[PDB]
Amino acid sequence: MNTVPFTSAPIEVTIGIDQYSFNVKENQPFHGIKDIPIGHVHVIHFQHADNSSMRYGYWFDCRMGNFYIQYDPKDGLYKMMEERDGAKFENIVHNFKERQMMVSYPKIDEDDTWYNLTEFVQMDKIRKIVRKDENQFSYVDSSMTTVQENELSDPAHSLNYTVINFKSREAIRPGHEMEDFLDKSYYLNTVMLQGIFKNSSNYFGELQFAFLNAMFFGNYGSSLQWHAMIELICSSATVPKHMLDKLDEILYYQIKTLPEQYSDILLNERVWNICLYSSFQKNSLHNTEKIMENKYPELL
Amino acid sequence: GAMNSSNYAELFNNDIKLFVDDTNVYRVTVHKTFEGNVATKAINGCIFTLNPKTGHLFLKIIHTSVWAGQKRLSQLAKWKTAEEVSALVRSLPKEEQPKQIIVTRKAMLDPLEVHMLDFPNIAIRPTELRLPFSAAMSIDKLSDVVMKATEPQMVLFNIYDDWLDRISSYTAFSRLTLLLRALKTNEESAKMILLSDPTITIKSYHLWPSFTDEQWITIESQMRDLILTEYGRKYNV
Ligand SMILES: CC(C)COc1ccc(C(=O)NN)cc1
């Protein structure tokens, strides 16, 4: 069980850790989060009380280093930093820990929610989507745009998701125009899976990361990416059976975790109705269709 | 974007553009089978691809053999249309290729866009107003070449005959569209109007009769009357 200590909490802020969140008051004695499960990526995220604009946060894996948070009064945000002095870090944490000034990652033992949302998400792939190579952790916020959004403006601060575009030469073989547009299996299986992602685990990992950035930061380009990756599978007549069964589980837990009051802006009516009711895979997502119909029957 | 009713003149500028109408590509007769079920029999069709500035018509004849053994023919017809338009563009010298292609039905947008990915600078555009090109098969010489075709074939026409020697392309297109709307609303009456006088003939190299300027005004007035009438006969006014 690992720890992310805080130097202090000088400004009032709602702090999220994965799917959990809690409020910290201005100058409240608060020195971080303990008992963070090893084996998963995690995200620690922030919304200031005075400016609910800009949700921002940091993806990290405690196996990769000792990380802490420190507010920067010049840049006006809580920053993640790595502590290289391993003994300095252990000593800081233990002091905050015998003084019980940290909150405990509040995992119920029955509860596989975070695993189920991050099953295929790896830090090394996150760091290729979010390029800042001198840090082991990755910053994301509400306003960051994607490489594809930039093609339609600062490249260093972009989300480099894999570009998916159904009306592109990459997606459409000369002479198979109608075939490839109406059945996207070539683009899914040859171009994306064999060609770019190499395997379905990396595909699902990017899909899961896109969803999480959409949900936690309201990042619009991430939501676009998530829906494109779903639609590419659902619009393929030929998908490996284990991928469909896994997709159904992935989306089930995503739909289960979505705040009820954010469905209006985070769920694209066209994609979901197409995927569940018109697409080749309309009959292959039983768990996802059932939770969607019982939780968001309006959208459909 | 979509052509609205506040840009009529854009049709007649000097940017090459073609209209593409697919409504006569997939044509069937519906009939009863011996068992009393219903079946379709396809008949020859055509893509209507028209330069509105010059009157040049690229009539790609669609022979019924193209449907043999195919499923979902109404869907295929849109993609076949887009394939043939793409092939036409590629066959033209670069300086004759269109800068815009306007489709008369919005269901042609994605098929044509996908077939024209190689031409990113050719704009594919929708029509905020439906055209009367479906009536092209009421032009006797066009209908004849389509129905006589025994194989796929492209035939080139000037749908304005020699009108541009005397009138502008705006006026020629308004005449063509007034004639086509007449033929669509009441074909027999429209055709009666056009041929009633046997001393006015259709030249061998023309589609329409050799009306003088004055006779065209009378004709045009008769077509307007027909359309207004039918519009009463239809709505009882
Ligand atoms: C390119 C659009 C602005 C013009 O569209 C039309 C032009 C003419 C007609 C017609 O039937 N006239 N009789 C219908 C639509």
Side-chain angles (χ1 to χ4, degrees), chain A residues 166-172 174-179 181-182, chain B residues 72 75-77 79 90 109-111 113-118:
Chain A
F166 296 139
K167 297 191 284 186
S168 74
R169 172 54 63 221
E170 297 68 36
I172 304 290
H176 301 252
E177 287 84 2
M178 181 187 196
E179 181 193 1
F181 185 72
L182 294 177
Chain B
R72 296 193 53 88
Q75 183 177 71
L76 181 62
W79 290 88
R90 296 168 204 277
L109 290 166
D110 277 357
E113 162 167 10
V114 168
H115 268 281
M116 304 284 291
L117 292 174
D118 292 333

Side-chain angles (χ1 to χ4, degrees), chain A residues 166 180-189 193 203 229-240 243-244 279-282 284:
Chain A
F166 296 139
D180 282 351
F181 185 72
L182 294 177
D183 174 6
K184 316 208 181 275
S185 303
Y186 152 77
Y187 191 33
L188 171 68
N189 293 304
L193 287 176
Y203 189 97
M229 298 188 77
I230 295 166
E231 186 172 0
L232 175 51
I233 291 170
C234 291
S235 299
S236 293
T238 301
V239 185
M243 266 191 70
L244 296 167
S279 77
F280 287 109
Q281 305 302 344
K282 63 193 176 303
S284 305

Side-chain angles (χ1 to χ4, degrees), chain A residues 62-151 154-175:
Chain A
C62 282
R63 294 174 287 190
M64 285 170 63
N66 301 313
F67 305 115
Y68 65 102
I69 299 291
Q70 181 168 122
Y71 183 74
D72 174 8
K74 176 163 163 74
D75 290 344
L77 80 176
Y78 286 99
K79 298 196 170 157
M80 181 165 283
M81 304 201 272
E82 182 166 357
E83 181 55 71
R84 76 159 291 116
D85 187 355
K88 186 176 190 180
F89 189 82
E90 286 177 29
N91 173 244
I92 286 293
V93 177
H94 172 267
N95 176 86
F96 289 159
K97 235 259 163 81
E98 263 272 52
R99 286 213 295 151
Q100 296 185 32
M101 310 238 66
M102 296 161 124
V103 289
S104 168
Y105 188 97
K107 198 185 155 302
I108 304 321
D109 314 289
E110 161 188 44
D111 181 23
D112 271 351
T113 293
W114 190 244
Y115 174 75
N116 290 337
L117 294 168
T118 61
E119 177 176 2
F120 301 97
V121 183
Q122 333 171 261
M123 260 319 300
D124 67 274
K125 297 312 197 314
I126 290 180
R127 297 184 68 242
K128 304 177 192 312
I129 296 167
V130 189
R131 307 193 161 289
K132 188 169 207 262
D133 286 352
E134 65 278 14
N135 299 326
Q136 293 287 289
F137 50 81
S138 300
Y139 171 94
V140 181
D141 66 33
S142 303
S143 74
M144 278 169 52
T145 54
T146 70
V147 160
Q148 177 173 53
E149 282 181 305
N150 298 328
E151 302 163 357
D154 177 27
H157 217 58
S158 277
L159 296 168
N160 301 276
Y161 293 118
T162 296
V163 175
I164 300 180
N165 177 0
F166 296 139
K167 297 191 284 186
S168 74
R169 172 54 63 221
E170 297 68 36
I172 304 290
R173 287 176 295 179

Side-chain angles (χ1 to χ4, degrees), chain B residues 96-211:
Chain B
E96 301 182 34
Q97 290 172 341
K99 299 291 183 169
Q100 301 175 11
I101 300 174
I102 305 155
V103 297
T104 61
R105 305 200 291 180
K106 301 186 215 65
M108 282 300 307
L109 290 166
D110 277 357
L112 191 59
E113 162 167 10
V114 168
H115 268 281
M116 304 284 291
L117 292 174
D118 292 333
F119 292 94
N121 291 358
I122 302 188
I124 305 303
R125 304 177 55 203
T127 208
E128 308 274 71
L129 334 77
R130 307 203 154 165
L131 279 155
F133 292 159
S134 70
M137 283 292 96
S138 299
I139 297 172
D140 290 327
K141 287 186 183 186
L142 301 187
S143 183
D144 285 352
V145 69
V146 169
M147 290 315 289
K148 292 193 211 298
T150 57
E151 46 186 316
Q153 172 181 8
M154 158 88 90
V155 184
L156 306 186
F157 296 91
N158 190 322
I159 201 159
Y160 297 153
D161 294 342
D162 60 355
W163 302 344
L164 293 180
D165 297 347
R166 304 194 62 81
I167 63 179
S168 66
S169 68
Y170 178 107
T171 293
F173 187 76
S174 313
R175 176 183 293 166
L176 177 61
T177 62
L178 165 58
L179 294 190
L180 291 193
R181 190 65 65 178
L183 290 162
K184 181 170 188 164
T185 312
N186 187 326
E187 185 175 13
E188 189 217 308
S189 309
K191 292 193 173 199
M192 282 180 59
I193 289 171
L194 281 165
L195 322 164
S196 50
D197 178 356
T199 81
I200 323 176
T201 65
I202 302 175
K203 295 296 147 298
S204 56
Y205 49 87
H206 281 170
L207 299 178
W208 314 95
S210 300
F211 291 122

Side-chain angles (χ1 to χ4, degrees), chain B residues 31-44:
Chain B
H31 59 85
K32 282 284 194 64
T33 72
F34 182 88
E35 291 76 30
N37 303 130
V38 176
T40 60
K41 179 186 164 305
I43 61 159
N44 288 345

Side-chain angles (χ1 to χ4, degrees), chain A residues 13 24 41 45 58 70 112 148 172 175 190 196 212 222 225 239 248 254 271:
Chain A
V13 61
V24 174
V41 306
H45 42 112
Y58 303 88
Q70 181 168 122
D112 271 351
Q148 177 173 53
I172 304 290
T190 300
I196 299 182
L212 291 167
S222 298
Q225 184 67 12
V239 185
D248 189 32
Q254 288 170 343
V271 169

